Amino acid sequence: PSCVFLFPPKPKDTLMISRTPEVTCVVVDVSHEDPEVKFNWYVDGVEVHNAKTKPREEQYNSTYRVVSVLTVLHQDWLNGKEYKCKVSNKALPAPIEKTISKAKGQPREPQVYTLPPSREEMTKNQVSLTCLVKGFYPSDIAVEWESNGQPENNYKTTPPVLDSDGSFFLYSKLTVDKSRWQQGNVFSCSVMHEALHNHYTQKSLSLS
Amino acid sequence: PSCVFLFPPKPKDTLMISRTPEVTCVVVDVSHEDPEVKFNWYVDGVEVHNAKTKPREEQYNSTYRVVSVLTVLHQDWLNGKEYKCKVSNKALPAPIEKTISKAKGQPREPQVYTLPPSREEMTKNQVSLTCLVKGFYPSDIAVEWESNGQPENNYKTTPPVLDSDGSFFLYSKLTVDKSRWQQGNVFSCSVMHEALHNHYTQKSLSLS
Ligand SMILES: *[C@@H]1O[C@H](CO[C@@H]2O[C@@H](C)[C@@H](O)[C@@H](O)[C@@H]2O)[C@@H](O[C@@H]2O[C@H](CO)[C@@H](O[C@@H]3O[C@H](CO[C@H]4O[C@H](CO)[C@@H](O)[C@H](O)[C@@H]4O[C@@H]4O[C@H](CO)[C@@H](O)[C@H](O)[C@H]4NC(C)=O)[C@@H](O)[C@H](O[C@H]4O[C@H](CO)[C@@H](O)[C@H](O)[C@@H]4O[C@@H]4O[C@H](CO)[C@@H](O)[C@H](O)[C@H]4NC(C)=O)[C@@H]3O)[C@H](O)[C@H]2NC(C)=O)[C@H](O)[C@H]1NC(C)=O
Ligand SMILES: *[C@@H]1O[C@H](CO[C@@H]2O[C@@H](C)[C@@H](O)[C@@H](O)[C@@H]2O)[C@@H](O[C@@H]2O[C@H](CO)[C@@H](O[C@@H]3O[C@H](CO[C@H]4O[C@H](CO)[C@@H](O)[C@H](O)[C@@H]4O[C@@H]4O[C@H](CO)[C@@H](O)[C@H](O)[C@H]4NC(C)=O)[C@@H](O)[C@H](O[C@H]4O[C@H](CO)[C@@H](O)[C@H](O)[C@@H]4O[C@@H]4O[C@H](CO)[C@@H](O)[C@H](O)[C@H]4NC(C)=O)[C@@H]3O)[C@H](O)[C@H]2NC(C)=O)[C@H](O)[C@H]1NC(C)=O
């Protein structure tokens, strides 16, 4: 009758005490007749009530997107607890359930290498600064770029890719004016992952 | 109850005359009590008759799967022709159609740059040779590594990532024993894409 979908928190929210990590239960295909759905949240089968149903929004196919959002503890998600979503109703014969948790296994620390642009990129107007991040488990990770403690926002990061040893890698690419790279400005690659000391490391990159 | 799935040809199959590119129409959850299936095929809305349809295959869940395969001309797919599979079935409300084509928009040449390992990495047993491929459109592309004309099979490539100018990039990572890199063996990164001359370029990498 209805498709239910359950989403983990963002990497960056579980790793920093100041941020707020949330699990997001999302029902699409809800027709006009049935208005309100009975969300029930459980942390290891044990019930918890810390919920918040975010009222509905309109759609281009006559159905409505009914969302719920459970705040969770940083150390609960990291330590691997099970987070069960249950949507009850009347227009469903039996009630639908969904269970997510952190991927299992020994966390592994990322190794973070910075890479300058290629000699052959050096003919262009904009150049490519590369941060290789490899050897990490699980795949949950965040990458950002800095110069003089100000965010550089002209970067893209690949999704994580499953390597031959069961660990993950990605590449982040920052594009900068060749003018900046030649003056000799320092650029930094910031990585946040559970297996890093204080969940944080940075590596600099500059023209040797 | 019946769902239709329509699969493009592989990137390499359309770029090389030697290969035979195919589009594939798969029908699933066909019923036991009403198993009669017809396929019609259209190329830019004009019907074509050369498709090769297989006999229905019983699955382990009391349902039939049926596959039809249309051979496409390389230049038709690269000229952006639309392939429509249409699937009919006596006991079904109305025919299920699906359409597929190469992604729309102007083609754009890949720039391929090779990157040696970070000196911070020149300490481990194994090092990472990096191939950066950026500025390409559409996202359909193939990447491989070699030394001395032999495939180097210890490689992983990222999926294509949408860059800020509307073009795609990715990276391919080749892991070699640190010793082979110190000797001075040449490694090569080859790329196939419709916007490259002869649909092909190769960029080599060695100790400097
Ligand atoms: C009516 O239309 C609506 C809306 O349509 C959409 O929006 C409109 C405006 C138009 O643009 C439409 O063209 C467009 O499609 C339909 O509602 C949609 O229903 C589909 C199902 O058909 C749902 O798709 C699922 O999506 C998830 C991924 O969703 C994230 O990423 C999307 C970005 O591409 C984004 O749209 C989503 O909102 C969502 O975003 C995340 O959400 C939270 C906030 O909610 C946030 O905290 C996150 O940070 C945010 N992240 C990002 C990056 O966006 C996808 O995973 C589902 O696929 C899984 O399940 C499938 C079937 O169950 C299966 O085919 C796949 O294999 C896949 O993976 C496995 O599946 C098994 C099988 O059950 C599963 O159990 C496993 O866990 C899983 N395994 C693994 C290892 O992963 C699925 O495809 C969308 O939720 C929904 N779209 C939107 C916009 O809400 C509605 O259905 C229409 N109705 C009709 C009748 O047509
Ligand atoms: C009864 O059994 C059958 C058969 O299953 C088999 O038998 C049972 C008993 C068990 O033994 C099973 O383990 C066994 O598999 C069930 O059949 C399945 O039904 C599901 C759907 O119900 C199908 O799902 C779709 O699969 C495709 C991907 O399919 C490729 O990869 C599969 C998994 O890796 C592989 O098994 C497939 O055969 C197929 O492989 C490809 O084959 C082609 C053709 O020859 C080949 O050239 C390719 O090389 C090859 N590729 C690979 C990698 O091998 C998946 O793409 C579908 O996803 C789309 O749609 C979803 C739902 O609509 C949606 O959630 C997704 O987001 C996605 O949507 C699309 O997204 C893209 C871009 O993002 C876009 O282009 C599209 O526009 C968009 N489409 C939308 C929104 O609609 C989907 O998951 C299985 O393939 C199918 N199994 C087989 C073998 O055919 C059946 O369901 C069972 N019945 C019941 C009642 O349970």
Author numbering:
A (entry chain B), B (entry chain A): 238 to 239, 239i, 240 to 444
Share the article's original sentences.
The two reported structures feature two different covalent adducts bound to the inserted cysteine. The cysteine-adduct and maleimide-adduct crystals diffracted to 0.23 nm and 0.27 nm resolutions, respectively. The inserted cysteine replaces Ser 239 and causes a 1-residue upward shift of Ser 239, Pro 238, and Gly 237. This enables Val 240 and all subsequent residues to maintain their wild-type locations. The new cysteine side chain points outward from the protein, into the solvent cleft between the A and B subunits. The new cysteine thiol appears accessible for conjugation to a linker/payload. The side chain of Ser 239 is now observed in the pocket formerly occupied by Pro 238, which has adequate volume but no H-bonding partner for the serine hydroxide. A wave of displacement then puts Pro 238 into the place normally occupied by Gly 237, formerly the last residue of the wild-type hinge. The observed location of Cys239i and the upward shift of residues Pro 238 and Ser 239 are similar in both chains of both adduct structures. The observed rearrangement of local structure adjacent to the C239i insertion provides an explanation for the previously reported loss of FcγR binding by Fc-C239i, by placing Pro 238 into the location where Gly 237 normally has an extended conformation that is incompatible with proline.
